[PDB]
Amino acid sequence: QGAQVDCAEFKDPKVYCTRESNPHCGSNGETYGNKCAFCKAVMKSGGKINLKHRGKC
């Protein structure tokens, strides 16, 4: 096992942004999905934004 939803190791170089490759939906906070959007937000989320990323939140 091991949930592979890490987003630090796939930052660079010029990888995850703009053209969203997955409408993924946050805990109970937001609908987004471009790898950058999610890692970027979640980073500065607060520490209470888990994920229920499938389709809608």
Swiss-Prot record:
The organism's place on the tree of life at top rank: Eukaryota
Primary subcellular site in the record, as a coarse category: secreted
Compartments, record wording: Secreted
Leftover remarks: The sequence of BUSI-IIA is shown.
GO cellular component: extracellular region
Site location (Reactive bond): R19, E20
Organism: Bos taurus
Lineage of the species this protein comes from: Eukaryota, Metazoa, Chordata, Craniata, Vertebrata
Keywords for the protein's UniProt record, in alphabetical order: Disulfide bond, Protease inhibitor, Pyrrolidone carboxylic acid, Secreted, Serine protease inhibitor, Signal
Disulphide bond pairs: C7-C39, C17-C36, C25-C57
The keyword Coiled coil appears for this protein: no
GO molecular function, one term: serine-type endopeptidase inhibitor activity
Primary role: Serine protease inhibitor selective for kallikreins. Efficiently inhibits KLK4, KLK5, KLK6, KLK7, KLK12, KLK13 and KLK14. Doesn't inhibit KLK8. Inhibits acrosin, trypsin, and chymotrypsin.
Domain Kazal-like: 2-57
Protein name per the record: Serine protease inhibitor Kazal-type 6
Residues of the whole record sequence present: 25 to 80 of 80
Tissues expressing the protein: Seminal plasma.
